[PDB]
Short mmCIF file of C-alpha atoms in Angstrom, two decimals:
data_model
loop_
_atom_site.label_atom_id
_atom_site.label_comp_id
_atom_site.label_asym_id
_atom_site.label_seq_id
_atom_site.Cartn_x
_atom_site.Cartn_y
_atom_site.Cartn_z
CA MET A 15 93.70 64.21 65.13
CA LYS A 16 93.37 60.35 64.87
CA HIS A 17 93.98 58.15 67.94
CA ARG A 18 97.32 56.99 66.26
CA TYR A 19 98.52 60.62 66.11
CA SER A 20 97.02 61.55 69.54
CA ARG A 21 100.35 62.50 71.17
CA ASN A 22 101.26 64.51 68.09
CA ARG A 23 99.00 67.29 69.38
CA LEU A 24 100.15 70.86 70.34
CA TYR A 25 103.17 70.17 68.08
CA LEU A 26 100.89 69.80 65.05
CA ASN A 27 97.48 70.98 64.60
CA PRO A 28 94.76 68.95 62.83
CA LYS A 29 95.31 70.74 59.42
CA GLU A 30 99.07 70.02 59.48
CA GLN A 31 98.51 66.34 60.37
CA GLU A 32 95.93 66.30 57.61
CA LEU A 33 98.30 68.10 55.18
CA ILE A 34 101.30 65.69 55.55
CA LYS A 35 98.97 62.64 55.39
CA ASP A 36 98.81 62.88 51.56
CA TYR A 37 102.10 64.71 50.86
CA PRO A 38 103.73 62.48 48.30
CA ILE A 39 107.34 61.71 49.26
CA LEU A 40 109.80 60.08 46.94
CA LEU A 41 112.52 58.15 48.54
CA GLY A 42 115.36 57.04 46.44
CA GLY A 43 117.31 54.36 48.38
CA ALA A 44 115.99 51.97 51.07
CA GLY A 45 119.19 51.64 53.13
CA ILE A 46 119.64 54.74 55.39
CA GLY A 47 116.27 55.56 53.77
CA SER A 48 114.50 52.65 55.52
CA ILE A 49 114.98 54.19 58.89
CA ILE A 50 113.86 57.51 57.49
CA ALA A 51 110.71 55.98 56.17
CA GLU A 52 109.60 54.49 59.51
CA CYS A 53 110.19 57.65 61.47
CA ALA A 54 108.38 59.73 58.81
CA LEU A 55 105.43 57.26 58.58
CA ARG A 56 104.91 57.11 62.33
CA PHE A 57 104.98 61.06 62.32
CA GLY A 58 102.02 61.04 59.91
CA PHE A 59 103.48 61.10 56.37
CA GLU A 60 101.40 58.35 54.82
CA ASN A 61 102.12 58.79 51.13
CA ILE A 62 105.65 57.42 50.44
CA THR A 63 107.05 55.91 47.22
CA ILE A 64 110.32 53.95 47.77
CA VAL A 65 112.54 52.89 44.91
CA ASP A 66 115.58 50.53 45.45
CA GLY A 67 116.99 47.63 43.49
CA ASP A 68 119.06 45.84 46.16
CA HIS A 69 118.36 42.79 48.38
CA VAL A 70 118.76 42.88 52.06
CA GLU A 71 122.28 41.85 53.11
CA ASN A 72 123.71 40.85 56.38
CA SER A 73 125.78 44.08 56.75
CA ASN A 74 122.47 46.15 56.71
CA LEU A 75 121.33 44.89 60.02
CA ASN A 76 123.66 47.21 61.96
CA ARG A 77 122.00 50.37 60.71
CA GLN A 78 119.00 49.62 58.48
CA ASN A 79 115.38 48.76 58.96
CA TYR A 80 115.53 45.08 58.33
CA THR A 81 115.51 41.75 60.24
CA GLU A 82 117.33 38.47 59.90
CA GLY A 83 114.31 37.12 57.94
CA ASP A 84 114.50 39.96 55.56
CA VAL A 85 117.96 38.96 54.33
CA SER A 86 118.14 38.04 50.68
CA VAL A 87 114.78 39.73 49.96
CA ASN A 88 114.23 42.80 47.90
CA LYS A 89 114.59 45.77 50.20
CA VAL A 90 111.52 47.48 48.87
CA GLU A 91 109.34 44.45 49.55
CA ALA A 92 110.91 44.14 53.09
CA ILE A 93 110.57 47.87 54.04
CA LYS A 94 106.92 47.82 52.89
CA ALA A 95 106.10 44.95 55.10
CA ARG A 96 107.73 46.82 58.10
CA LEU A 97 105.94 50.05 57.21
CA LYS A 98 102.51 48.44 56.40
CA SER A 99 102.47 46.61 59.69
CA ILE A 100 102.96 49.91 61.33
CA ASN A 101 100.11 51.48 59.34
CA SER A 102 97.81 49.34 57.19
CA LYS A 103 95.87 52.29 55.84
CA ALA A 104 99.12 54.04 54.65
CA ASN A 105 99.74 54.49 50.97
CA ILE A 106 103.28 52.78 50.59
CA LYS A 107 104.16 52.46 46.98
CA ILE A 108 107.28 50.59 46.12
CA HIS A 109 109.13 49.82 42.88
CA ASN A 110 111.90 47.35 42.80
CA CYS A 111 114.17 48.95 40.06
CA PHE A 112 117.37 50.64 39.90
CA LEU A 113 117.24 54.19 38.74
CA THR A 114 118.89 55.00 35.38
CA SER A 115 119.11 58.15 33.22
CA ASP A 116 116.22 56.94 31.23
CA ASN A 117 113.59 56.10 33.87
CA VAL A 118 114.55 58.46 36.71
CA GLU A 119 112.33 61.33 35.52
CA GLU A 120 109.25 59.33 35.22
CA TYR A 121 109.50 58.09 38.87
CA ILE A 122 110.05 61.68 40.16
CA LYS A 123 106.96 62.98 38.39
CA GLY A 124 104.16 63.42 40.92
CA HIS A 125 106.05 64.07 44.11
CA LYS A 126 106.17 67.26 46.15
CA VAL A 127 109.56 66.49 47.87
CA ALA A 128 112.37 64.02 47.42
CA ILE A 129 114.91 62.31 49.49
CA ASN A 130 118.12 61.35 47.53
CA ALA A 131 119.62 58.41 49.38
CA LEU A 132 121.31 56.85 46.47
CA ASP A 133 124.65 55.18 46.33
CA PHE A 134 127.11 57.11 44.11
CA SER A 135 127.83 53.81 42.45
CA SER A 136 126.05 55.13 39.32
CA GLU A 137 125.88 58.48 37.76
CA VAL A 138 122.23 59.03 38.64
CA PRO A 139 122.51 60.67 42.16
CA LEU A 140 123.29 64.13 40.73
CA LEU A 141 121.02 63.80 37.54
CA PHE A 142 118.21 62.82 40.00
CA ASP A 143 118.78 66.19 41.68
CA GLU A 144 118.82 68.11 38.41
CA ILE A 145 115.35 66.65 37.38
CA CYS A 146 113.98 67.59 40.78
CA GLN A 147 115.36 71.11 40.70
CA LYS A 148 113.66 71.69 37.33
CA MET A 149 110.34 70.48 38.77
CA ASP A 150 110.33 72.55 42.01
CA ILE A 151 110.97 69.38 44.12
CA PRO A 152 113.41 70.00 47.02
CA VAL A 153 115.83 67.26 47.63
CA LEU A 154 117.03 65.93 51.10
CA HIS A 155 120.50 64.39 51.07
CA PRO A 156 121.02 62.35 54.26
CA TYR A 157 124.41 61.05 55.28
CA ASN A 158 125.36 58.59 58.07
CA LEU A 159 128.39 60.14 59.65
CA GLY A 160 128.58 57.49 62.38
CA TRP A 161 128.12 59.50 65.57
CA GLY A 162 126.44 62.30 63.57
CA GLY A 163 123.57 62.76 61.22
CA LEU A 164 124.07 65.05 58.26
CA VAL A 165 121.22 66.42 55.99
CA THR A 166 121.42 68.98 53.19
CA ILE A 167 118.49 70.14 51.11
CA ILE A 168 119.03 70.76 47.48
CA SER A 169 116.63 73.46 46.74
CA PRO A 170 115.21 73.86 43.25
CA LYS A 171 116.44 77.39 42.60
CA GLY A 172 119.67 76.94 44.45
CA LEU A 173 123.10 75.40 44.10
CA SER A 174 123.33 71.84 43.25
CA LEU A 175 125.75 69.26 44.67
CA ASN A 176 127.63 69.73 41.39
CA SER A 177 129.13 72.88 43.04
CA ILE A 178 131.39 70.67 45.25
CA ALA A 179 132.40 68.20 42.35
CA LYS A 180 135.50 68.56 40.15
CA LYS A 181 134.57 67.61 36.62
CA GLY A 182 137.50 65.29 36.15
CA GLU A 183 136.92 62.72 38.91
CA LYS A 184 133.71 61.10 39.97
CA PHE A 185 131.99 62.48 43.03
CA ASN A 186 130.83 60.50 45.93
CA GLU A 187 130.00 60.73 49.62
CA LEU A 188 133.54 61.21 50.81
CA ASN A 189 133.58 64.57 48.96
CA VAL A 190 130.37 65.68 50.84
CA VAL A 191 131.87 64.68 54.23
CA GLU A 192 135.14 66.38 53.53
CA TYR A 193 133.22 69.57 52.48
CA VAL A 194 131.28 69.53 55.77
CA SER A 195 134.43 68.98 57.95
CA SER A 196 136.39 71.64 56.19
CA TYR A 197 133.44 74.14 56.54
CA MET A 198 133.14 73.43 60.32
CA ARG A 199 136.91 73.88 60.91
CA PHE A 200 137.12 76.92 58.71
CA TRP A 201 134.22 78.67 60.64
CA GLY A 202 135.70 77.92 64.04
CA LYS A 203 133.53 74.88 64.88
CA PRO A 204 135.93 71.92 64.08
CA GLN A 205 134.46 68.42 64.24
CA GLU A 206 137.54 66.58 65.26
CA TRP A 207 135.65 63.30 65.36
CA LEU A 208 134.70 63.61 61.74
CA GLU A 209 138.11 64.41 60.55
CA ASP A 210 139.30 61.48 62.53
CA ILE A 211 136.98 59.02 60.90
CA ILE A 212 137.75 60.51 57.47
CA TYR A 213 141.54 60.08 58.05
CA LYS A 214 141.06 56.52 59.21
CA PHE A 215 138.97 55.69 56.19
CA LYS A 216 141.41 57.17 53.69
CA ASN A 217 144.39 55.36 55.14
CA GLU A 218 142.59 52.05 54.85
CA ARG A 219 144.54 49.75 52.28
CA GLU A 220 141.56 48.08 50.71
CA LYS A 221 138.69 50.06 49.25
CA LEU A 222 135.48 49.26 51.05
CA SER A 223 132.21 51.09 51.58
CA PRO A 224 132.16 53.82 54.26
CA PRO A 225 131.45 52.71 57.79
CA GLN A 226 128.20 53.78 59.42
CA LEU A 227 126.71 53.26 62.81
CA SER A 228 123.10 52.90 63.93
CA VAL A 229 123.27 56.09 65.92
CA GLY A 230 123.79 58.37 62.91
CA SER A 231 121.10 56.45 61.02
CA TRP A 232 118.60 57.05 63.83
CA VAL A 233 119.62 60.80 64.17
CA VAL A 234 119.35 61.48 60.51
CA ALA A 235 115.87 59.90 60.31
CA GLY A 236 114.75 62.41 62.95
CA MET A 237 116.35 65.30 61.07
CA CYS A 238 114.80 64.27 57.81
CA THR A 239 111.36 63.86 59.39
CA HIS A 240 111.59 67.35 60.81
CA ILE A 241 112.73 68.78 57.45
CA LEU A 242 109.87 67.05 55.71
CA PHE A 243 107.30 68.63 58.10
CA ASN A 244 108.89 72.08 57.54
CA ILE A 245 108.95 71.74 53.82
CA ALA A 246 105.39 70.46 53.64
CA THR A 247 104.03 73.18 56.00
CA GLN A 248 106.29 75.81 54.37
CA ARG A 249 108.39 76.62 57.35
CA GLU A 250 111.93 78.02 56.74
CA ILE A 251 114.76 75.64 55.95
CA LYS A 252 118.39 75.93 55.05
CA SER A 253 119.25 74.98 51.44
CA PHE A 254 122.62 73.80 50.21
CA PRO A 255 125.39 74.95 50.47
CA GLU A 256 123.93 75.08 54.00
CA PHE A 257 123.31 71.83 55.89
CA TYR A 258 122.17 70.42 59.27
CA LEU A 259 124.62 68.55 61.37
CA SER A 260 123.40 66.83 64.71
CA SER A 261 125.68 64.73 66.97
CA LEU A 262 126.00 63.92 70.67
CA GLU A 263 128.32 67.03 71.05
CA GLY A 264 125.65 69.36 69.67
CA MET B 15 133.13 41.43 64.42
CA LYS B 16 130.27 39.65 62.59
CA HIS B 17 129.14 40.37 59.00
CA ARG B 18 126.22 41.86 60.82
CA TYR B 19 128.46 44.31 62.42
CA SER B 20 130.70 44.59 59.36
CA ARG B 21 129.97 48.21 58.58
CA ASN B 22 130.81 49.17 62.28
CA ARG B 23 134.64 49.24 61.70
CA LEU B 24 136.88 52.14 62.30
CA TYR B 25 134.24 53.73 64.64
CA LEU B 26 134.71 50.72 66.86
CA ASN B 27 137.60 48.46 66.87
CA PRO B 28 137.00 44.66 67.17
CA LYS B 29 137.88 44.58 70.88
CA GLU B 30 135.19 47.20 71.70
CA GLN B 31 132.51 45.47 69.65
CA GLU B 32 133.12 42.30 71.73
CA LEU B 33 133.04 44.34 75.06
CA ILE B 34 129.67 45.97 74.41
CA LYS B 35 128.26 42.71 73.19
CA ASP B 36 127.84 41.46 76.80
CA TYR B 37 127.71 44.82 78.57
CA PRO B 38 124.57 44.30 80.67
CA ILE B 39 122.06 47.09 80.12
CA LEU B 40 118.96 47.59 82.33
CA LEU B 41 116.07 49.43 80.57
CA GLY B 42 113.25 50.51 82.88
CA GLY B 43 110.33 51.36 80.50
CA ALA B 44 109.88 49.94 76.99
CA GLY B 45 108.19 53.03 75.55
CA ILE B 46 110.74 55.66 74.49
CA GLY B 47 113.04 52.79 75.49
CA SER B 48 111.71 50.59 72.71
CA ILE B 49 113.21 52.90 70.09
CA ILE B 50 116.40 53.00 72.13
CA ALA B 51 116.57 49.19 72.32
CA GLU B 52 116.49 48.64 68.61
CA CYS B 53 119.17 51.22 67.86
CA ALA B 54 121.38 50.06 70.79
CA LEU B 55 120.91 46.27 69.77
CA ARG B 56 121.92 47.04 66.16
CA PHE B 57 124.92 48.93 67.36
CA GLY B 58 126.16 45.64 69.13
CA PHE B 59 124.76 45.78 72.67
CA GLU B 60 123.34 42.42 72.93
CA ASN B 61 122.57 42.04 76.67
CA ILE B 62 119.40 43.98 77.54
CA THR B 63 116.88 43.55 80.36
CA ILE B 64 113.55 45.30 79.74
CA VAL B 65 111.01 45.94 82.43
CA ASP B 66 107.60 47.24 81.70
CA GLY B 67 104.10 46.23 82.76
CA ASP B 68 102.10 48.08 80.06
CA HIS B 69 100.41 46.91 77.00
CA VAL B 70 100.69 48.49 73.47
CA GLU B 71 98.06 51.23 72.88
CA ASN B 72 97.18 53.03 69.64
CA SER B 73 98.78 56.22 70.77
CA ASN B 74 102.17 54.41 70.83
CA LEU B 75 102.49 53.81 67.10
CA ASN B 76 103.53 57.49 66.40
CA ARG B 77 106.77 57.19 68.31
CA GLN B 78 107.36 53.73 69.75
CA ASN B 79 108.70 50.46 68.36
CA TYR B 80 105.45 48.67 68.05
CA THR B 81 103.14 47.62 65.06
CA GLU B 82 99.46 47.31 64.55
CA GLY B 83 99.62 43.57 65.30
CA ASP B 84 101.39 44.29 68.67
CA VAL B 85 98.47 46.35 69.90
CA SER B 86 96.89 45.10 73.22
CA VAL B 87 99.97 42.89 73.95
CA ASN B 88 102.47 43.58 76.69
CA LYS B 89 105.03 46.02 75.49
CA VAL B 90 107.78 43.77 76.80
CA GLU B 91 106.33 40.86 74.79
CA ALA B 92 106.35 42.99 71.63
CA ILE B 93 109.74 44.58 71.90
CA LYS B 94 111.49 41.23 72.49
CA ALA B 95 109.82 40.00 69.31
CA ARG B 96 111.06 42.96 67.26
CA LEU B 97 114.48 42.86 68.78
CA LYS B 98 114.96 39.08 68.64
CA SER B 99 113.83 39.10 64.93
CA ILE B 100 116.75 41.55 64.32
CA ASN B 101 119.26 39.34 66.27
CA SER B 102 118.15 35.77 67.11
CA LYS B 103 121.33 35.13 69.17
CA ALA B 104 120.79 38.24 71.24
CA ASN B 105 120.16 38.13 75.02
CA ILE B 106 116.98 39.95 75.34
CA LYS B 107 115.54 39.44 78.84
CA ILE B 108 112.04 40.82 79.60
CA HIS B 109 109.99 41.14 82.78
CA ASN B 110 106.30 41.86 82.48
CA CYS B 111 105.79 43.54 85.86
CA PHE B 112 105.62 47.08 87.26
CA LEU B 113 108.53 48.25 89.35
CA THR B 114 107.70 48.83 93.03
CA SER B 115 109.65 49.84 96.15
CA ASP B 116 110.21 46.20 96.87
CA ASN B 117 111.39 44.73 93.60
CA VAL B 118 113.36 47.57 92.05
CA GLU B 119 116.60 46.76 93.79
CA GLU B 120 116.63 43.17 92.66
CA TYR B 121 115.87 44.04 89.05
CA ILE B 122 118.78 46.60 89.10
CA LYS B 123 121.22 44.00 90.45
CA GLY B 124 123.55 42.58 87.81
CA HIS B 125 123.66 45.56 85.31
CA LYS B 126 126.55 47.80 84.49
CA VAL B 127 124.27 50.64 83.21
CA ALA B 128 120.53 51.44 83.40
CA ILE B 129 118.21 53.50 81.30
CA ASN B 130 115.39 55.09 83.44
CA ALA B 131 112.43 55.60 81.13
CA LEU B 132 109.90 55.20 83.95
CA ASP B 133 106.70 57.43 83.88
CA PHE B 134 106.92 59.89 86.68
CA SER B 135 103.29 58.76 87.67
CA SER B 136 104.66 55.45 88.95
CA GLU B 137 106.06 55.13 92.38
CA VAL B 138 109.72 54.41 91.84
CA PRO B 139 111.43 56.93 89.37
CA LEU B 140 113.67 58.74 91.90
CA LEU B 141 114.17 55.66 94.12
CA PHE B 142 115.36 53.73 91.05
CA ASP B 143 118.32 56.26 90.68
CA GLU B 144 119.35 56.13 94.39
CA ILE B 145 119.73 52.40 94.25
CA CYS B 146 121.82 52.67 91.08
CA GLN B 147 124.12 55.17 92.59
CA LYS B 148 124.56 52.97 95.64
CA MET B 149 125.74 50.32 93.17
CA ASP B 150 127.96 52.34 90.82
CA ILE B 151 125.40 51.92 88.04
CA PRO B 152 125.08 55.10 85.93
CA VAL B 153 121.54 56.00 84.83
CA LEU B 154 120.51 57.43 81.48
CA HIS B 155 117.47 59.60 81.50
CA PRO B 156 116.11 60.01 78.01
CA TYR B 157 113.29 62.38 77.14
CA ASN B 158 111.12 63.14 74.03
CA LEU B 159 110.99 66.88 73.70
CA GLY B 160 109.10 66.57 70.35
CA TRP B 161 111.66 68.07 67.93
CA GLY B 162 114.58 67.35 70.23
CA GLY B 163 116.16 64.46 71.99
CA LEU B 164 117.32 65.05 75.65
CA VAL B 165 119.51 62.83 77.70
CA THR B 166 121.04 63.36 81.12
CA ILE B 167 123.19 60.88 82.96
CA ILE B 168 123.06 60.48 86.67
CA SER B 169 126.48 59.42 87.73
CA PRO B 170 126.83 57.33 90.81
CA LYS B 171 128.88 59.73 92.82
CA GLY B 172 127.27 62.84 91.43
CA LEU B 173 123.95 64.79 91.67
CA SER B 174 120.65 63.03 91.27
CA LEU B 175 117.43 64.30 89.78
CA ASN B 176 116.43 65.23 93.28
CA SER B 177 118.37 68.46 93.02
CA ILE B 178 115.63 69.98 90.82
CA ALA B 179 112.64 68.30 92.63
CA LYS B 180 110.92 70.50 95.28
CA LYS B 181 110.81 69.25 98.84
CA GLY B 182 107.10 68.49 99.46
CA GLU B 183 105.62 68.90 95.90
CA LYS B 184 105.53 66.23 93.24
CA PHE B 185 108.18 65.76 90.56
CA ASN B 186 107.50 64.93 86.90
CA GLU B 187 109.15 65.32 83.54
CA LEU B 188 107.91 68.86 83.23
CA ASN B 189 110.29 69.84 85.99
CA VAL B 190 113.14 68.24 84.05
CA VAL B 191 112.17 70.03 80.81
CA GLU B 192 111.69 73.41 82.52
CA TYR B 193 115.07 72.99 83.97
CA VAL B 194 116.60 72.39 80.57
CA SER B 195 115.00 75.44 79.07
CA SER B 196 116.03 77.67 81.96
CA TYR B 197 119.63 76.33 81.96
CA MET B 198 119.72 76.78 78.16
CA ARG B 199 118.31 80.32 78.49
CA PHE B 200 120.70 81.01 81.45
CA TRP B 201 123.61 80.17 79.06
CA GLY B 202 122.44 82.52 76.36
CA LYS B 203 121.13 79.60 74.22
CA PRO B 204 117.36 79.88 74.69
CA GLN B 205 115.25 77.16 73.05
CA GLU B 206 112.14 79.16 72.17
CA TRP B 207 110.55 76.18 70.52
CA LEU B 208 111.00 74.28 73.81
CA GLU B 209 109.60 77.13 75.90
CA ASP B 210 106.66 77.43 73.47
CA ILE B 211 105.48 73.80 73.72
CA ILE B 212 105.90 73.91 77.62
CA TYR B 213 103.67 77.03 77.68
CA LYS B 214 101.12 75.43 75.39
CA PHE B 215 101.04 72.34 77.52
CA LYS B 216 100.69 73.97 80.84
CA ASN B 217 97.93 76.34 79.60
CA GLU B 218 95.91 73.38 78.29
CA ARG B 219 92.35 73.57 79.54
CA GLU B 220 92.29 69.69 80.07
CA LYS B 221 94.96 67.77 81.95
CA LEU B 222 96.50 65.41 79.43
CA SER B 223 99.74 63.51 78.74
CA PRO B 224 102.64 65.36 77.22
CA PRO B 225 102.83 65.41 73.48
CA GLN B 226 105.73 63.58 71.91
CA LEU B 227 106.94 63.07 68.26
CA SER B 228 108.76 60.40 66.51
CA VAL B 229 111.62 62.79 65.65
CA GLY B 230 112.76 63.13 69.33
CA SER B 231 112.48 59.60 69.99
CA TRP B 232 114.70 58.54 67.07
CA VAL B 233 117.13 61.29 67.98
CA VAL B 234 117.24 60.30 71.75
CA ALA B 235 117.65 56.69 70.72
CA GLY B 236 120.83 57.69 68.87
CA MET B 237 122.11 59.79 71.64
CA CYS B 238 121.44 56.92 74.13
CA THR B 239 123.31 54.44 71.92
CA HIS B 240 126.30 56.82 71.73
CA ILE B 241 126.36 57.42 75.46
CA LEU B 242 126.05 53.63 76.10
CA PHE B 243 129.20 53.12 73.99
CA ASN B 244 131.04 55.90 75.89
CA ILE B 245 130.05 54.51 79.32
CA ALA B 246 131.05 50.97 78.37
CA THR B 247 134.27 52.03 76.85
CA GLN B 248 135.21 54.42 79.70
CA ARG B 249 135.06 57.57 77.53
CA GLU B 250 134.29 60.78 79.15
CA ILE B 251 130.57 61.67 79.69
CA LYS B 252 128.61 64.73 80.71
CA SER B 253 126.91 64.17 84.03
CA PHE B 254 123.86 65.88 85.69
CA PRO B 255 123.33 68.88 86.18
CA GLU B 256 124.71 68.88 82.68
CA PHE B 257 122.92 67.20 79.78
CA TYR B 258 122.91 66.46 76.06
CA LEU B 259 120.35 68.25 73.90
CA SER B 260 120.04 67.54 70.20
CA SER B 261 117.62 68.93 67.65
CA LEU B 262 117.53 70.17 64.03
CA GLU B 263 117.84 73.73 65.17
CA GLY B 264 121.18 72.92 66.82
#
């Protein structure tokens, strides 16, 4: 393997390092996704498309891959600068556009795997998955659970996130986190910390975005990079309704 | 809190965010520690001393917090640039010198907690811990097990890493990792992936450095940041001979 990937040896053979070099990844959302991108790029995934329409805001600096100088710049331009200073020969393609029902299919075309890191602020997170399912593109959903990282993979032929939604109210990340906490408690592995942060958040008077910590961001980037390597080299993975949860206590 | 730490709420209360702000951390080794440094800084730990005498090499870019432009510069020079570009008002103190039997005590002096990321090929890895114990400074030992992140905390009045070192024969990280696999297997939780890479590494024809992956670095960085929050806030911690092991398979 190359001198940059020298310490990747034994874990990866030359053909695997070679394989993931060109494996086209689509990353929707450069927030939690900006941490994911760096870890995956350094691992050896050199073909990443990143789509995001926001600018870098101050509140991102506690958990996202941006600097004080990046604030107010389009995230996609900022994360490409960070990524291309890590690997100049990498194929980092960005598109500074919001995903809508009309354009989302055209961006997805051409990718072998996708990471859905989209805010539920529009109705595109789930439609994004439907298009990926139809096209044999597995979808990673990373979540920042503060102390923990959560990843679930929507597999093309498996259940979609729709299965946890009730059709009368809109579905966001709080429903995913509540599903995970209830599953753990039901199966005898209760995550009392997760239920604790869920309770605190619900009893907040004002409606604010969910809190997140750098630790969960860093953990979930590692989980995602691993999952990407397993999907690209066709190693077994859990598909939704199964998920991966990683935290200091296991 | 600041708008930079805005999204930290509920997980940390304002009084904790202030406390860890000045909580003096000593980081011995800016390799795996460079990933730890960014995650811990963004969390809110703003008082970090970094000691390392090495320069950035090509093999670092697959798992360490450096860029192509940083290559051939002192790691300590590069990581302060990265960290101080994330937080300009942060208190990031570096020392471009290797640790020896004579200077290691004076570097330790003044910190409430330390992160021992010293190569076991230097002279001071175990002596570093003894001095910290003498001073009631807990020591985090983070390791990159490829797919997993491993942290063990030497607490001042508890067992040191000496307990797994053999009297008369040299001690390195392979002894730590072989202990973890044996302990895990002893408790009925064998990590066969870990045992596999250890076997592969020992039966290497050539004598080379251990392989490491970006996945474990990012995971261990999150673990270390969580542990640091617990140590500063006087939350319970697992001490050596116990440890924290985090991986996708777990």
